[PDB]
Amino acid sequence: ILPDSVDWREKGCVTEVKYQGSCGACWAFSAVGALEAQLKLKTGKLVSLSAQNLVDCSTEKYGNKGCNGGFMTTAFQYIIDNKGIDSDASYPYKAMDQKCQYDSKYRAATCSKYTELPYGREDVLKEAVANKGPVSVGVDARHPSFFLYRSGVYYEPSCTQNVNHGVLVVGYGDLNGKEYWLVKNSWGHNFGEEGYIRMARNKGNHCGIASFPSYPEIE
Numbered sequence: 001i002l003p004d005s006v007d008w009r010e011k012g013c014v015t016e017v018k019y020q021g022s023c024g025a026c027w028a029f030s031a032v033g034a035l036e037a038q039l040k041l042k043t044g045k046l047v048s049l050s051a052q053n054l055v056d057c058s059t060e061k062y063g064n065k066g067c068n069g070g071f072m073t074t075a076f077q078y079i080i081d082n083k084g085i086d087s088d089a090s091y092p093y094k095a096m097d098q099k100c101q102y103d104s105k106y107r108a109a110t111c112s113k114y115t116e117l118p119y120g121r122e123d124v125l126k127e128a129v130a131n132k133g134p135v136s137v138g139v140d141a142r143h144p145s146f147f148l149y150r151s152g153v154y155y156e157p158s159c160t161q162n163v164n165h166g167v168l169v170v171g172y173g174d175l176n177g178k179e180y181w182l183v184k185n186s187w188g189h190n191f192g193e194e195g196y197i198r199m200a201r202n203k204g205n206h207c208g209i210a211s212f213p214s215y216p217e218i219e
């Protein structure tokens with residue numbers, strides 16, 4: 001039986017909200033966020049991982065385009081292939097494309113595998129969030145209402161399943177009769193509820209939240 005609500009922030013598995021600036025690195029933040037939780041679960045230590053490392057190093061070979069976008073799944077494969085990712089402190093975020101500067105002496109995490117969940121299945125997503133940890137997802141964040149979100153549960157009739165923005169599901173629940181997914185964004189603490197947005201859950205894969213979910217694992 002799955003819990004009715006989950007919030008991975010309560011378990012100390014979620015790092016501070018980051019600010020991507022004018023660099024489309026949402027995919028990198030989503031990926032590191034998922035791996036940060038697994039690292040805490042495995043080692044007991046909560047450590048911010050380097051989104052910049054992904055921007056600079058998980059590039060053409062992974063179908064990624066740095067500040068012009070990328071995939072969380074191929075980011076995970078890069079970490080696997082590379083046998084590590086550096087900490088945020090050692091390889092800080094600059095919101096621009098740079099030369100790959102990965103160094104294993106600053107490695108803070110590894111990844112052994114990742115799992116892509118079946119398309120559109122919010123029940124499967126719920127199970128993964130409850131049993132595995134935070135899950136990287138894409139959402140349709142193109143609508144003016146998304147940028148202006150402040151509170152409550154986000155429901156936008158014009159939303160689509162065409163996803164364009166990488167975020168991290170860190171929980172789920174029910175607020176005043178509205179089921180939601182608890183989503184960590186990377187637009188700083190000014191966005192939404194201290195960097196978070198509650199997005200409609202079990203409302204027909206709203207904004208494509210369950211379209212392309214994935215999570216990494218550590219040996």
Ligand SMILES: CN1CCN(C(=O)Nc2ccc3c(c2)[C@H](NC(=O)c2ccccc2)CCC3)CC1
Nearest residue numbers: 027063064065068069070071138164165166212
């Ligand atoms: C069968 N494939 C189906 C699609 N898929 C995904 O994971 N899609 C997905 C999942 C998440 C995200 C995106 C795509 C978007 N990334 C891009 O727009 C983009 C742009 C430039 C270069 C590379 C990718 C937005 C960020 C979040 C892999 C399996």
